[PDB]
């Protein structure tokens, strides 16, 4: 292709087939049930470049074979009608910005943009235009994409647009009707006292306004922005309040400021952490040192609601990925560490499984369904968690649609705008928490990405590039690293409102004033106005302020580690804002900065209380046995594993409790436990308390009940002093809506001034979305979805020790199940599980029963934690004690025998109430002191014993001499698992989704098993350390890895001094690999995995002449040792023209579920000359996975045949029984004969998928039997490199 475009040149070049077997037959299946007769369809993927310059032939060949990846499908000849889908032109796609690195890194910058599209192949005949546009409609989004029927028709994707103008507005010349036709015109949505600020404020600067000056004040006073409802004067029942409902979140703060370092001054909150070794590569050396100093905690917890409505990918990706900016933008610098996912939506209504409790009440065209939200959304928030290398460690999910009898009558109560929440913790060191200040004459600079026209349904389509933040967080890390030389002054994030909010604010919180040019800022397409430039909501960017002389600091910093940035102004004396355009030779800014910050009446909210009545339960259809059955299958109690198998749960190698649970692997997990480094028994925990269908019977209740789950939920962990929890307190409401307002003002008042004081928990942070419904036309009437008052509490806290945290995994050893009942009796049935699953809303529900009692459970649980006298715990939340009781049951494998004749003669209600509380597990011989330590608490009119657990298979709870439920715990663990079995059917692949579900269904699964062929005590890496002599090994990483640190720690514990080597200190020719003799490439996403995943890193060594020597001399040298884990394992097979003794090694292809899997999968060391693997042969131990490409794939059966004869296999993927298995997910990608790991010949390079870095600790394993050390058996691998060396 060299087809006219301007002074460039447009190339199609051709790629491998888009879509694998499943989703042709999907789509087929989909064509014929819309009456298209489609009889065969083919996918294929097309590459456009856009070139600058010309291309020779030694240069288009290093084109055409970047463009070669990805399975290895059977392409066909074209045949048919051709529908080609690329993105809406004006919009570059992330792939087309990471593809475009890899051409630049490469040597080939002729090259200007890369983008990709899908050639659809349609062998239909006979369709009317009409039945066309309904072919193409399936294979696009409306909201994203675009269709065209010419390969030669992407050239207007690639459009040279000249720079807009800047527009102004004539108040001088039209009067205040210029403005009113403006806030119409630009979409300004401002209210009468903001448009008559507006009219004074430009009269007395006597000019007329610039539409660029209109809109940013318009992202400066929008409600959210100012939070103006939070801040507002209130009148309930025609009587005046003393506080706002920000003021009384703020009393949690001034009757506890224990612990908390900094609150409401950042966009994040900081306490108190523990005094652990922050490991880190040194700026001078290179060299990764463990630096002994405090390790203080932050905390931050956001909401994307509307954007995930339009587009669920994009709405979920940047939910986090804005979050993620928030986190490292908190003081002068911190570091991410876990984070917790979190959904409220609609009805799912999946085909071929509808519940009885579902019922459609339509839904806006506009917007998409629960379903598209809870398939597209979880994958976008993980896409970014994973591509930047945070591990998403908890979370909820809520499912509400129904027409309820509340506050306003009978309505529609739901959430079609759903609740999308992203938050988690991080690390800052003691003297980055508080914000420096900022100089005359600092330079004001933008971290991170070319900015595009994103914020401005079409304006609610975000944009995730997470390999950008990747890059960006390495530049915020590497300045926290050089302790009081950090560069950084002040840092902010980029989000709403984009630079037109965070520059004026990072000035502002200085007391400065500003001077910007416009041609400073990078852009990424060239057509846009000034008020585009500067208005748009352009993710992965960060603003802050650098002194002038640390200027060519903070420029080495940045172009190593190849993150964006460009110096855009100087801080001023004079508090005034201005922007300057070098091309127009005018001043598009021009305003002092209070006139932006500008003030007008303050909000004053006279509302009146309602209150729902709401009948007792209509018990007719009711039976205990279905209510089980129902139960069991709504989607807020059941399985999550769609949602948890999809995000990362090992990175960083500090996650000590992950959703998975026992050797069984279920997703019970009552908080999430994170370890303070890589070198302690200190750390982080994280919990969700959230009650949401309760706002709809009684406002106050539901609030306390989130504060409540959050805190039992969060209790199993040694923390110690309750004053140690921090709370995080996202508000959802419909702020207009009868009774809302009124149950707001109660909610907060609830928790602001009544129980967090009462029980000593602040709330250093919060956000609020306050417009949670929907309005569109059905038939001729108007209907309303309007979501109940949503309160998602997050607890965090310190942990004392790691090691001593309680799962809900039972043990058969001679127990006792006890039932802390904080419900007090009460029983209530009103707004829980069961009511909504009998489409119903109750009575009376659940509250925080006595105050002193929940304090005193907690502080009970703390003494059972520290004393060890717990088994195993699990909280009453969805479903009541009933799923309790089976969650407890799946993760033991085994049998319950308990009698609920103590808790009233009511047995429905004493199984499903979802009062506070839940069941300990105790030694029998313990069980008369934990009753005696829980009175002394004053607890003794709550503890029930309800039974034991036993080995089996029997679920009975029984009421004396008579039998109230008895079934098989298996047939309620595939109850239980149904939905997320139908979730990944229409997610991933059937054949996968179906060989989880019925692996569950076998009785006989041991669980993952250990055996040991060596002794995992035996450091024989010992003699070696003692002598002094620490060998060095290259820890190399690409633009994009994430898991190097914890690499470079399990190096260090072996005995070597791990030195960070990025590919840029080997390009730019600063470091090289003559003075090692040991090598490993890291994990992560590099490129984002784009061109296929470990091939532009791969390729950026082998197009390079002088890098690409120095790792062939490397290789080729006879004392050299070289370890590829994950990414750099799909690296390093991708060099082996490099590496000796490599012909027979396979590629690392698409998993065969289409899916990423962050599994806990069982592997076997097998027979192969591997040096690392010495005297681990035979071993069965569980390994931690984390891939989407890990698939070995080999060219034919001759090839795999032989690479089995040559014995290079290291690792083989078994089932818990012990064979060598093929299928999903006790071998997760699909590799034949379950290859994960080969090596070579001489057996000195060995590459692997899992990561036995992320789990080199006890600590750091998922699950391991009771009595292993501090090591795993994964840090023989270290060892075995240490003896090898010498
Ligand atoms: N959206 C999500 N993302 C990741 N994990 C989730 C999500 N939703 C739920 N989980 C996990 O599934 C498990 C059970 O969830 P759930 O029963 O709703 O929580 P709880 O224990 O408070 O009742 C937990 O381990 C939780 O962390
Ligand atoms: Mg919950
Ligand atoms: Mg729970
Ligand atoms: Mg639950």
Same mark, same amino acid.
């Given at each position: 292709?060299?087809?006219?475009?301007?002074?460039?040149?447009?190339?199609?070049?051709?790629?491998?087939?888009?879509?694998?077997?499943?989703?042709?037959?999907?789509?087929?299946?989909?064509?014929?049930?819309?009456?298209?007769?489609?009889?065969?369809?083919?996918?294929?993927?097309?590459?456009?470049?856009?070139?600058?310059?010309?291309?020779?032939?030694?240069?288009?060949?290093?084109?055409?074979?970047?463009?070669?990846?990805?399975?290895?499908?059977?392409?066909?000849?074209?045949?048919?009608?051709?529908?080609?889908?690329?993105?809406?032109?004006?919009?570059?796609?992330?792939?087309?910005?990471?593809?475009?690195?890899?051409?630049?890194?490469?040597?080939?910058?002729?090259?200007?943009?890369?983008?990709?599209?899908?050639?659809?192949?349609?062998?239909?005949?006979?369709?009317?235009?009409?039945?066309?546009?309904?072919?193409?409609?399936?294979?696009?989004?409306?909201?994203?994409?675009? =269709?065209?029927?010419?390969?030669?028709?992407?050239?207007?994707?690639?459009?040279?647009?000249?720079?807009?103008?800047?527009? +102004?507005?004539?108040?001088?010349?039209?009067?205040?009707?210029?403005?009113?036709?403006?806030?119409?015109?630009?979409?300004?949505?401002?209210?009468?006292?903001?448009?008559?600020?507006?009219?004074?404020?430009?009269?007395?600067? !006597?000019?007329?306004?610039?539409?660029?000056?209109?809109?940013?004040?318009?992202?400066?006073?929008?409600?959210?922005?100012?939070?103006?409802?939070?801040?507002?004067?209130?009148?309930?029942?025609?009587?005046?309040?003393?506080?706002?409902?920000?003021?009384?979140?703020?009393?949690?703060?001034?009757?506890?400021?224990?612990?908390?370092?900094?609150?409401?001054?950042?966009?994040?909150?900081?306490?108190?952490?523990?005094?652990?070794?922050?490991?880190?590569?040194?700026?001078?050396?290179?060299?990764? %040192?463990?630096?002994?100093?405090?390790?203080?905690?932050?905390?931050?917890?956001?909401?994307?609601?509307?954007?995930?409505?339009?587009?669920?990918?994009?709405?979920?990706?940047?939910?986090?990925?804005?979050?993620?900016?928030?986190?490292?933008?908190?003081?002068?610098?911190?570091?991410?560490?876990?984070?917790?996912?979190?959904?409220?939506?609609?009805?799912?209504?999946?085909?071929?499984?509808?519940?009885?409790?579902?019922?459609?009440?339509?839904?806006?065209?506009?917007?998409?369904?629960?379903?598209?939200?809870?398939?597209?959304?979880?994958?976008? #928030?993980?896409?970014?968690?994973?591509?930047?290398?945070?591990?998403?460690?908890?979370?909820?999910?809520?499912?509400?649609?129904?027409?309820?009898?509340?506050?306003?009558?009978?309505?529609?109560?739901?959430?079609?705008?759903?609740?999308?929440?992203?938050?988690?913790?991080?690390?800052?060191?003691?003297?980055?928490?508080?914000? @420096?200040?900022?100089?005359?004459?600092?330079?004001?600079?933008?971290?991170?990405?070319?900015?595009?026209?994103?914020?401005?349904?079409?304006?609610?389509?975000?944009?995730?590039?997470?390999?950008?933040?990747?890059?960006?967080?390495?530049?915020?890390?590497?300045?926290?690293?050089?302790?009081?030389?950090?560069?950084?002054?002040?840092?902010?994030?980029?989000?709403?409102?984009?630079?037109?909010?965070?520059?004026?604010?990072?000035?502002?919180?200085?007391?400065?004033?500003?001077?910007?040019?416009?041609?400073?800022?990078?852009?990424?397409?060239?057509?846009?106005?000034?008020?585009?430039?500067?208005?748009?909501?352009?993710?992965?960017?960060?603003?802050?302020?650098?002194?002038?002389?640390?200027?060519?600091?903070?420029?080495?910093?940045?172009?190593?580690?190849?993150?964006?940035?460009?110096?855009?102004?100087?801080?001023?004396?004079?508090?005034?804002?201005?922007?300057?355009?070098?091309?127009?030779?005018?001043?598009?800014?021009?305003?002092?900065?209070?006139?932006?910050?500008?003030?007008?009446?303050?909000?004053?909210?006279?509302?009146?209380?309602?209150?729902?009545?709401?009948?007792?339960?209509?018990?007719?259809?009711?039976?205990?046995? %279905?209510?089980?059955?129902?139960?069991?299958?709504?989607?807020?109690?059941?399985?999550?594993?769609?949602?948890?198998?999809?995000?990362?749960?090992?990175?960083? #190698?500090? *996650?000590?409790?992950?959703?998975?649970?026992?050797?069984?692997?279920?997703?019970?997990?009552?908080?999430?436990?994170?370890?303070?480094?890589? %070198?302690?028994?200190?750390?982080?925990?994280?919990?969700?308390?959230?009650?949401?269908?309760?706002?709809?019977?009684?406002?106050?209740?539901?609030?306390?009940?989130?504060? #409540?789950?959050?805190?039992?939920?969060?209790?199993?962990?040694?923390?110690?002093?309750?004053?140690? &929890?921090?709370?995080?307190?996202?508000?959802?409401?419909?702020?207009?809506?009868?009774?809302?307002?009124?149950?707001?003002?109660?909610?907060?008042?609830?928790?602001?001034?009544?129980?967090?004081?009462?029980?000593?928990?602040?709330?250093?942070?919060?956000?609020?979305?306050?417009?949670?419904?929907?309005?569109?036309?059905?038939?001729?009437?108007?209907?309303?979805?309007?979501?109940?008052?949503?309160?998602?509490?997050?607890?965090?806290? /310190?942990?004392?020790?790691?090691?001593?945290?309680?799962?809900?995994?039972?043990?058969?050893?001679?127990?006792?199940?006890?039932? &802390?009942?904080?419900?007090?009796?009460?029983?209530?049935? !009103?707004?829980?599980?069961?009511?909504?699953?009998?489409?119903?809303?109750?009575?009376?529900?659940?509250?925080?029963?006595?105050?002193?009692?929940?304090?005193?459970?907690?502080?009970?649980?703390?003494?059972?934690?520290?004393?060890?006298?717990?088994?195993?715990?699990?909280?009453?939340?969805?479903?009541?004690?009933?799923?309790?009781?089976?969650?407890?049951?799946?993760?033991?494998?085994?049998?319950?025998?308990?009698?609920?004749?103590?808790?009233?003669?009511?047995?429905?209600?004493?199984?499903?109430?979802?009062?506070?509380?839940?069941?300990?597990?105790?030694?029998?011989?313990?069980?008369?002191?934990?009753?005696?330590?829980?009175?002394?608490?004053?607890?003794?009119?709550?503890?029930?014993?309800?039974?034991?657990?036993?080995?089996?298979?029997?679920?009975?709870?029984?009421?004396?001499?008579?039998? =109230?439920?008895?079934?098989?715990?298996?047939?309620? /663990?595939?109850?239980?698992?149904?939905?997320?079995?139908?979730?990944?059917?229409?997610?991933?692949?059937?054949?996968?989704?179906?060989?989880?579900?019925?692996?569950?269904?076998?009785?006989?699964?041991?669980?993952?098993?250990?055996?040991?062929?060596?002794?995992?005590?035996?450091?024989?890496?010992?003699?070696?350390?003692?002598?002094?002599?620490?060998?060095?090994?290259? *820890?190399?990483?690409?633009?994009?890895?994430?898991?190097?640190?914890?690499?470079?720690?399990?190096?260090?514990?072996?005995?070597?001094?791990?030195?960070?080597?990025?590919?840029?200190?080997?390009?730019?020719?600063?470091?090289?690999? @003559?003075?090692?003799?040991?090598?490993?490439?890291?994990?992560?996403?590099?490129?984002?995995?784009?061109?296929?995943?470990?091939?532009?890193?791969?390729?950026?060594?082998?197009?390079?002449?002088?890098?690409?020597?120095?790792?062939?001399?490397?290789?080729?040298?006879?004392?050299?040792?070289?370890?590829?884990?994950?990414?750099?394992?799909?690296?390093?097979?991708?060099?082996?023209?490099?590496?000796?003794?490599?012909?027979?090694?396979?590629?690392?292809?698409?998993?065969? +579920?289409?899916?990423?899997?962050?599994?806990?999968?069982?592997?076997?060391?097998?027979?192969?000359?591997?040096?690392?693997?010495?005297?681990?042969?035979?071993?069965?131990?569980?390994?931690?996975?984390?891939? #989407?490409?890990?698939?070995?794939?080999?060219?034919?059966?001759?090839?795999?045949?032989?690479?089995?004869?040559?014995?290079?296999?290291?690792?083989?993927?078994?089932?818990?029984? @012990?064979?060598?298995?093929?299928?999903?997910?006790?071998?997760?990608?699909?590799?034949?004969?379950?290859?994960?790991?080969?090596?070579?010949?001489?057996?000195?390079?060995?590459?692997?998928?899992?990561?036995?870095?992320?789990?080199?600790?006890?600590?750091?394993?998922?699950?391991?039997?009771?009595?292993?050390?501090?090591?795993?058996?994964?840090? /023989?691998?270290?060892?075995?490199?240490?003896?090898?060396?010498?």
């Amino acid at each position: 292709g060299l087809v006219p475009r301007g002074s460039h040149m447009m190339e199609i070049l051709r790629g491998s087939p888009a879509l694998s077997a499943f989703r042709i037959n999907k789509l087929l299946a989909r064509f014929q049930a819309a009456n298209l007769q489609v009889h065969n369809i083919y996918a294929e993927y097309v590459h456009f470049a856009d070139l600058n310059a010309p291309l020779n032939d030694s240069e288009q060949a290093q084109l055409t074979r970047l463009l070669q990846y990805g399975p290895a499908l059977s392409s066909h000849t074209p045949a048919g009608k051709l529908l080609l889908v690329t993105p809406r032109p004006g919009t570059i796609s992330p792939w087309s910005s990471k593809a475009t690195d890899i051409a630049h890194n490469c040597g080939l910058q002729q090259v200007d943009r890369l983008e990709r599209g899908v050639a659809y192949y349609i062998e239909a005949s006979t369709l009317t235009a009409e039945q066309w546009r309904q072919v193409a409609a399936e294979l696009h989004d409306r909201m994203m994409e675009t =269709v065209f029927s010419s390969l030669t028709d992407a050239e207007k994707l690639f459009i040279h647009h000249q720079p807009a103008p800047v527009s +102004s507005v004539d108040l001088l010349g039209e009067g205040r009707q210029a403005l009113i036709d403006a806030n119409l015109r630009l979409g300004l949505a401002l209210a009468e006292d903001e448009i008559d600020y507006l009219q004074e404020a430009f009269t007395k600067l !006597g000019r007329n306004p610039n539409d660029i000056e209109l809109y940013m004040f318009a992202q400066a006073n929008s409600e959210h922005c100012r939070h103006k409802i939070f801040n507002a004067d209130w009148i309930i029942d025609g009587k005046p309040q003393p506080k706002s409902l920000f003021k009384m979140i703020k009393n949690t703060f001034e009757t506890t400021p224990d612990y908390v370092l900094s609150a409401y001054k950042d966009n994040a909150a900081v306490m108190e952490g523990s005094a652990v070794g922050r490991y880190f590569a040194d700026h001078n050396t290179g060299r990764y %040192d463990f630096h002994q100093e405090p390790a203080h905690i932050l905390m931050k917890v956001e909401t994307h609601n509307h954007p995930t409505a339009i587009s669920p990918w994009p709405g979920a990706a940047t939910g986090s990925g804005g979050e993620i900016r928030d986190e490292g933008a908190t003081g002068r610098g911190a570091k991410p560490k876990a984070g917790l996912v979190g959904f409220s939506v609609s009805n799912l209504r999946i085909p071929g499984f509808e519940q009885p409790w579902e019922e459609d009440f339509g839904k806006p065209e506009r917007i998409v369904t629960a379903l598209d939200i809870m398939t597209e959304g979880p994958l976008g #928030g993980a896409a970014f968690n994973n591509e930047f290398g945070r591990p998403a460690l908890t979370g909820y999910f809520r499912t509400y649609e129904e027409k309820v009898n509340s506050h306003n009558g009978e309505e529609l109560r739901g959430y079609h705008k759903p609740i999308m929440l992203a938050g988690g913790i991080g690390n800052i060191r003691a003297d980055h928490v508080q914000k @420096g200040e900022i100089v005359v004459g600092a330079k004001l600079i933008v971290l991170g990405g070319p900015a595009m026209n994103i914020g401005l349904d079409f304006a609610s389509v975000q944009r995730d590039n997470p390999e950008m933040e990747r890059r960006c967080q390495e530049v915020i890390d590497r300045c926290w690293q050089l302790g009081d030389a950090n560069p950084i002054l002040f840092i902010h994030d980029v989000g709403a409102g984009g630079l037109s909010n965070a520059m004026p604010e990072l000035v502002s919180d200085g007391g400065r004033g500003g001077k910007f040019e416009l041609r400073d800022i990078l852009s990424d397409e060239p057509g846009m106005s000034p008020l585009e430039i500067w208005c748009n909501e352009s993710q992965e960017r960060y603003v802050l302020a650098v002194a002038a002389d640390q200027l060519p600091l903070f420029d080495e910093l940045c172009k190593r580690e190849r993150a964006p940035y460009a110096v855009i102004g100087d801080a001023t004396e004079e508090q005034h804002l201005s922007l300057h355009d070098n091309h127009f030779d005018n001043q598009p800014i021009d305003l002092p900065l209070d006139v932006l910050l500008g003030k007008t009446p303050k909000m004053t909210r006279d509302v009146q209380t309602l209150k729902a009545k709401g009948d007792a339960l209509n018990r007719a259809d009711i039976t205990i046995a %279905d209510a089980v059955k129902r139960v069991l299958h709504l989607p807020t109690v059941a399985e999550k594993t769609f949602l948890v198998t999809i995000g990362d749960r090992t990175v960083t #190698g500090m *996650v000590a409790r992950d959703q998975m649970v026992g050797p069984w692997q279920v997703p019970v997990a009552d908080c999430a436990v994170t370890t303070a480094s890589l %070198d302690s028994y200190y750390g982080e925990a994280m919990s969700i308390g959230e009650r949401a269908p309760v706002a709809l019977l009684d406002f106050a209740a539901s609030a306390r009940l989130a504060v #409540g789950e959050a805190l039992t939920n969060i209790a199993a962990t040694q923390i110690g002093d309750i004053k140690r &929890i921090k709370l995080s307190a996202n508000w959802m409401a419909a702020a207009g809506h009868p009774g809302e307002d009124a149950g707001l003002y109660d909610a907060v008042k609830a928790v602001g001034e009544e129980l967090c004081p009462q029980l000593g928990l602040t709330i250093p942070v919060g956000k609020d979305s306050m417009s949670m419904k929907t309005r569109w036309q059905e038939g001729n009437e108007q209907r309303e979805m309007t979501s109940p008052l949503s309160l998602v509490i997050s607890a965090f806290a /310190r942990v004392e020790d790691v090691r001593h945290t309680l799962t809900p995994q039972l043990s058969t050893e001679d127990n006792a199940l006890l039932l &802390i009942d904080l419900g007090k009796g009460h029983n209530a049935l !009103g707004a829980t599980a069961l009511a909504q699953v009998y489409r119903q809303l109750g009575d009376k529900p659940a509250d925080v029963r006595d105050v002193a009692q929940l304090k005193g459970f907690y502080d009970a649980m703390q003494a059972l934690v520290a004393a060890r006298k717990l088994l195993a715990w699990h909280d009453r939340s969805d479903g009541g004690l009933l799923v309790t009781l089976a969650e407890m049951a799946f993760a033991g494998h085994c049998g319950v025998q308990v009698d609920i004749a103590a808790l009233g003669d009511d047995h429905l209600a004493a199984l499903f109430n979802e009062e506070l509380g839940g069941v300990i597990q105790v030694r029998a011989e313990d069980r008369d002191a934990v009753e005696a330590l829980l009175a002394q608490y004053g607890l003794a009119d709550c503890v029930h014993y309800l039974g034991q657990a036993l080995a089996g298979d029997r679920f009975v709870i029984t009421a004396n001499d008579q039998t =109230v439920f008895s079934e098989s715990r298996t047939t309620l /663990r595939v109850w239980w698992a149904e939905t997320t079995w139908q979730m990944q059917r229409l997610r991933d692949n059937p054949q996968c989704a179906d060989q989880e579900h019925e692996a569950k269904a076998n009785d006989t699964d041991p669980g993952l098993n250990v055996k040991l062929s060596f002794d995992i005590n035996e450091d024989i890496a010992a003699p070696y350390i003692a002598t002094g002599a620490r060998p060095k090994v290259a *820890v190399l990483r690409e633009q994009g890895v994430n898991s190097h640190v914890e690499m470079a720690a399990a190096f260090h514990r072996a005995g070597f001094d791990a030195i960070d080597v990025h590919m840029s200190d080997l390009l730019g020719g600063r470091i090289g690999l @003559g003075n090692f003799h040991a090598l490993v490439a890291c994990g992560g996403f590099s490129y984002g995995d784009v061109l296929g995943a470990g091939e532009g890193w791969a390729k950026s060594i082998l197009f390079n002449h002088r890098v690409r020597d120095e790792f062939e001399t490397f290789f080729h040298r006879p004392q050299t040792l070289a370890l590829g884990v994950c990414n750099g394992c799909q690296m390093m097979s991708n060099l082996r023209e490099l590496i000796p003794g490599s012909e027979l090694w396979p590629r690392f292809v698409r998993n065969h +579920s289409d899916r990423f899997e962050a599994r806990f999968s069982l592997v076997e060391v097998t027979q192969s000359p591997s040096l690392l693997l010495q005297g681990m042969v035979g071993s069965q131990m569980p390994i931690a996975v984390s891939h #989407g490409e890990g698939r070995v794939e080999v060219r034919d059966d001759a090839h795999l045949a032989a690479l089995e004869s040559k014995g290079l296999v290291a690792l083989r993927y078994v089932d818990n029984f @012990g064979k060598v298995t093929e299928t999903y997910p006790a071998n997760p990608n699909g590799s034949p004969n379950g290859i994960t790991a080969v090596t070579t010949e001489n057996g000195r390079v060995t590459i692997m998928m899992p990561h036995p870095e992320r789990v080199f600790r006890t600590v750091a394993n998922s699950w391991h039997p009771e009595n292993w050390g501090e090591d795993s058996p994964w840090m /023989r691998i270290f060892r075995n490199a240490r003896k090898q060396l010498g």
